[PDB]
Amino acid sequence: CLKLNLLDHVFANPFMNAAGVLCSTEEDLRCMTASSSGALVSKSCTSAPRDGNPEPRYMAVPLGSINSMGLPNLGFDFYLKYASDLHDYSKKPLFLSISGLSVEENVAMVRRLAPVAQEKGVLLELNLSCPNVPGKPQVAYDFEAMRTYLQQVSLAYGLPFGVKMPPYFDIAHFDTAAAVLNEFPLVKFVTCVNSVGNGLVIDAESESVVIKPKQGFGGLGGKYILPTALANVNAFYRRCPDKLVFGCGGVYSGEDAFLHILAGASMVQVGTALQEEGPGIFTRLEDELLEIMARKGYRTLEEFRGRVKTI
Amino acid sequence: CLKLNLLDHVFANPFMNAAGVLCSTEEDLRCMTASSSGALVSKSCTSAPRDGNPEPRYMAVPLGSINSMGLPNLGFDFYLKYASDLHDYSKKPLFLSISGLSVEENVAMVRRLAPVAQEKGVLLELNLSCPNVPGKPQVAYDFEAMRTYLQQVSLAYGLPFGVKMPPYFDIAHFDTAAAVLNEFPLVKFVTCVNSVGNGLVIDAESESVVIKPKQGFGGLGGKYILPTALANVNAFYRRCPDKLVFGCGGVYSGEDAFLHILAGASMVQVGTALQEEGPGIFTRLEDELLEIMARKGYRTLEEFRGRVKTI
Amino acid sequence: CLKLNLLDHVFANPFMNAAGVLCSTEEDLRCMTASSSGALVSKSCTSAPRDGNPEPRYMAVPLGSINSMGLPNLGFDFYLKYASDLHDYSKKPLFLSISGLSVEENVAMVRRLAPVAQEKGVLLELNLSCPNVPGKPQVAYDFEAMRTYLQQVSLAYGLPFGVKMPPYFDIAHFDTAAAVLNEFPLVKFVTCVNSVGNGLVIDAESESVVIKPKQGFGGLGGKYILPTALANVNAFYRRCPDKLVFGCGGVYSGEDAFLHILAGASMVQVGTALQEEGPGIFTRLEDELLEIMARKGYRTLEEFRGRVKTI
Amino acid sequence: CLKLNLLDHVFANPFMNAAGVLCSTEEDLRCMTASSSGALVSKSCTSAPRDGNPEPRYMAVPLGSINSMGLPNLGFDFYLKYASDLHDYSKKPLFLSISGLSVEENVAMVRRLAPVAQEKGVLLELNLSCPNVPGKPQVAYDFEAMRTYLQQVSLAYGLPFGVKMPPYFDIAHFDTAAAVLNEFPLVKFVTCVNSVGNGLVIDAESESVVIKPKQGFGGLGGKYILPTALANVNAFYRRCPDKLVFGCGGVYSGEDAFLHILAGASMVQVGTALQEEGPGIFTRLEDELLEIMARKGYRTLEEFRGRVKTI
Numbered sequence A, B, C, D: 001c002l003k004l005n006l007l008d009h010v011f012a013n014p015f016m017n018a019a020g021v022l023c024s025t026e027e028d029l030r031c032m033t034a035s036s037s038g039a040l041v042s043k044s045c046t047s048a049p050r051d052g053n054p055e056p057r058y059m060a061v062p063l064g065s066i067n068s069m070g071l072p073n074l075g076f077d078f079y080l081k082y083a084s085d086l087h088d089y090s091k092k093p094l095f096l097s098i099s100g101l102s103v104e105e106n107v108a109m110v111r112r113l114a115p116v117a118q119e120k121g122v123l124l125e126l127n128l129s130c131p132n133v134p135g136k137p138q139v140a141y142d143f144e145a146m147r148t149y150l151q152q153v154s155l156a157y158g159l160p161f162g163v164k165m166p167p168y169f170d171i172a173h174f175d176t177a178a179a180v181l182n183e184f185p186l187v188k189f190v191t192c193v194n195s196v197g198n199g200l201v202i203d204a205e206s207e208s209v210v211i212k213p214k215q216g217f218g219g220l221g222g223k224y225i226l227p228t229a230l231a232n233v234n235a236f237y238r239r240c241p242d243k244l245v246f247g248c249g250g251v252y253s254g255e256d257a258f259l260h261i262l263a264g265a266s267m268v269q270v271g272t273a274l275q276e277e278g279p280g281i282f283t284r285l286e287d288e289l290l291e292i293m294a295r296k297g298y299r300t301l302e303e304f305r306g307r308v309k310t311i
């Protein structure tokens, strides 16, 4: 079975959407809850509604996707209200991603989320890796900034929560990031990873960048970022032994999800692939993941999670 | 024509091999020199010869490659010897990529290199972004270290040279890296970019990592990193106006090379693609680039360099 | 818009799945129907259920895929049942691919399919190009054989239908195949092309073929055959002016579909790319094709279909 | 050793250029002779000089090439004059590729070539698979015409010779083609394969075919056709046991050449790759093939020729 118990919650399966994909509106959330996904995470929100960056801000490309959405969301209020009143937790666990543009904006939000998570069970995913807000660089790329955010969020939230991490490409950054992460016992999970910040897709024909925000610089997702995502899931799975690592990046197949789990992933989030395929992808991913586990003789996810064989 | 005059040199075309690919042995260099490439850069060398990391250390994958070569080179002595005696400069400009594991080591090399560069015109490409030497994190990810390396190298070299840059994925990082690079007038060119550091490719069937070194972590190249290379080439093209930007990454066609140049690249280096196709690729890339320039009405690379239109 | 009216049916977009890919089970079909694809075609079926050829029988390779599936299907009964009862035609047009191993079998099937198509509008795609059934060479390669199959089908079916054509690599064959197809007015569409037959993928390390059937000979699909697919789509688009030409082969991007449509394709089918990416590919393809039409100022597909420019 | 004895000739290695690539002018021939290739083949020639088809007629694409050269050759006289007076047989065996547009043209040539072949040892490669001469279909796709061509050629030549075969994609075709081939004992070798006929490359940007001849239809070469080439090499390796099969198609590395030999190739020709890389590729291919044989413990090609393992 693909079931698993994480953060005092039961998950039909490890699949769920990657924050920002089909989880902005009540309808996306209701669809995600309706899908066969093991859980769902709401759009990374801020205090007030955000129109996001100017369009075109998302482009589906052959190897995945580039995007500079710019945290377009219906506002914390809505998502908190969804978590507190609209979500049917009998259906599946809900993760509410937050992404205040300042540590105090995040603190202000988690204080309000606290009583709801306390009462509802909604799980907080602190997004410290948005690479698409102009003027706002991935917070988790600034280690002390991240350290502060977590001290401030831990303090004001006082409940278990996770952090959506930006991909790191330096072994030292793997070490340091995990060092920071491990100083916070409330950080029960880290989601690896967020879009590979600030890629640039150029259309040769038009000789123009494909997205409008930040001169075409946006987060890369999809096939492009799989090896990078697996590295981070694994790097942090090893470094953060007392925490759960949620895999995210380049998942299109049960095989991809399998490598993620093999890499140490508990939950496996699907961004780009979901963006293009729709919630139906989860049933497919689950079947695919099961066909594989079948072949390999794995009855449970635990049997092979983080069991990637090295040479 | 695809001819460009850069760094007091004439290049037949903007194409060349990426440091490390087909440029380790004397035969690779002779092979690169014989190729139709506008130039060639040698394998990143250390003072002493290096066996590199344990094999398998390079894996070609559908979307490029992952490698943890570990700077396997024949030693500075050889490459400086090739630079000073073996390379036929009448054929094409030669770049000597130096990748000391310490600032002292690089200073020891660039010191012995200077006289040669002075007479032969060999161009120095300082590698401040190798992501595969165990315990040696990408120097260019450490802005202060990068600065120390640049002033020590600039000082001991006293000649124009370039830097092989690591891909950055944070706007603040492009700005700070440029801030560091721009302090040194001798740094005439920055090559963007080196392998996307510490990806992890897992074979679902064997449930094992494809490469042996560092538990499967290696630099990614090819398709995967194209948007990341264009972003970086463009990021530093804009930020380092007084410097040339050599594009490297994801180049398989003249279209890719077109995007790189459109982004700001002067020279375009081919890594993975060359690794899997042989030097014949340069002829193709050149025909292809010319076919694109022909259609768009471009007679010179200068006409469309850095001319990537934004929305 | 990508909409288009073909064979008295409305198609949301030109995109669909290549027969045999994600369309063998009821779940595959419901998955394709749920996708953003403008239509779907069921697995080439035979009178009774087939287990197909010995596995491994499919191999995704860097440049596409090879496969000797061997017409593994749930039997004609199932797919007619799907056509007649399961498929929601409000969603999108359904094509039912038939691939009897003899003319009598196809006739027996189409006779039963007729009443269904007659009432539901399910479209027949006669597969005269399967290159994986041991002992059964592609029908469309024996022109007299093809002429007979079409006489019998046209006669026994009496309704408009299409033919999945094998790739031809001889101008004489384009002429003759077309000459043959054009004798059958019921042949409203010809899908170019089926897999490039009997290619052989050999693994260097194992020094063994990658698939088990027919000593490793299987149909190639994907990147490998795009040029070949455009040729056929174009050759037949030119030769069968009274018929529609459905493109298929090497479609991974909206640009590939664009070439197909530019070559003369009405519907564009995705096989290998879909096999590996999942139904999400259609949304991506649609977005990519639209962005291209956008840049080129095309409001409709009919604006650039078969408008490939020659020199 | 890469050395092999064939057709009563000694070959340093199995490599040679593909007919048409680097072998049209006296200088090309001199380059191929100078190269480290074990043998060379002259451009397919016709009795009289041919300008070939209108340019552009050859396009190097990311997966190989497309071409409609139209047999541009310096005429049989020159080539016969090369084989009789200019070639240095002390360097490497010479194959003279003949491609008459009529059976009488081929007979006219082989008659005159016979004496020179009797004296100099030049080997005849009858091209029965050109797919780029307007109005002239691949002769070998016409089993009877092919039969007639070989009766006439075998009669007028009376000496050992080979045939440049077009790739087949139908098992029955392999069987029949072999059936026709096997009748002639003088046909000591069949070169598999020639270009994959009449692929269509269209440039999405210009929306135009890349080559001018035949509305863009040209032979496909390079990476595209490797699997097809290995298939044909192996198909004819098994079907024509008393004949040598020279492999040709998709060779870029010693690994590819290794696959061809594995498949059953005695000699391995390089076309597209050579077209882009130059005669230097042969040294590279020989090094690479030896490096593979080194690891597999193969001391000779004979040890692994046609030893491809099937599942």
Ligand SMILES: Cc1cc2nc3c(=O)[nH]c(=O)nc-3n(C[C@H](O)[C@H](O)[C@H](O)COP(=O)(O)O)c2cc1C
Residues within 6 Å of the ligand: A018, A019, A020, A021, A043, A044, A045, A058, A064, A065, A067, A069, A071, A097, A127, A164, A193, A194, A195, A196, A220, A221, A222, A223, A225, A248, A249, A250, A251, A269, A270, A271, A272, A273, A275
């Ligand atoms: C349209 C778009 C919007 C996204 N919005 C968010 C966001 O709100 N918060 C967040 O943590 N991640 C967001 N993501 C990033 C994904 O959650 C994920 O980190 C990234 O897409 C890589 O996963 P993938 O390859 O599965 O696409 C977004 C991604 C895309 C495609």
Ligand SMILES: Cc1cc2nc3c(=O)[nH]c(=O)nc-3n(C[C@H](O)[C@H](O)[C@H](O)COP(=O)(O)O)c2cc1C
Residues within 6 Å of the ligand: B018, B019, B020, B021, B043, B044, B045, B058, B064, B065, B067, B069, B071, B097, B099, B127, B130, B164, B193, B194, B195, B196, B219, B220, B221, B222, B223, B225, B248, B249, B250, B251, B269, B270, B271, B272, B273, B275
């Ligand atoms: C075989 C292997 C060796 C490499 N060696 C070096 C090197 O010595 N110095 C360097 O700066 N980059 C080295 N690289 C990185 C490449 O130079 C190039 O930056 C990277 O592959 C991205 O380019 P690509 O996408 O074209 O492959 C190496 C890459 C690989 C595949």
Ligand SMILES: Cc1cc2nc3c(=O)[nH]c(=O)nc-3n(C[C@H](O)[C@H](O)[C@H](O)COP(=O)(O)O)c2cc1C
Residues within 6 Å of the ligand: C018, C019, C020, C021, C043, C044, C045, C058, C064, C065, C067, C069, C071, C097, C099, C127, C164, C193, C194, C195, C196, C220, C221, C222, C223, C225, C248, C249, C250, C251, C269, C270, C271, C272, C273, C275
């Ligand atoms: C797994 C596999 C199964 C297929 N089954 C069928 C089939 O049943 N009937 C048919 O006409 N084509 C079948 N095809 C051929 C494809 O429909 C398609 O024509 C071919 O794959 C070329 O397109 P592609 O490059 O998009 O893969 C199959 C292909 C593959 C990949």
Ligand SMILES: Cc1cc2nc3c(=O)[nH]c(=O)nc-3n(C[C@H](O)[C@H](O)[C@H](O)COP(=O)(O)O)c2cc1C
Residues within 6 Å of the ligand: D018, D019, D020, D021, D043, D044, D045, D058, D064, D065, D067, D069, D071, D097, D127, D164, D193, D194, D195, D219, D220, D221, D222, D223, D225, D248, D249, D250, D251, D269, D270, D271, D272, D273, D275
């Ligand atoms: C420029 C060009 C010219 C060619 N000329 C001939 C030739 O005249 N005779 C011939 O039999 N094949 C000719 N071919 C086909 C090649 O010999 C070879 O069979 C085909 O290109 C596939 O091999 P490859 O993948 O290594 O390119 C030519 C191909 C190209 C690229």
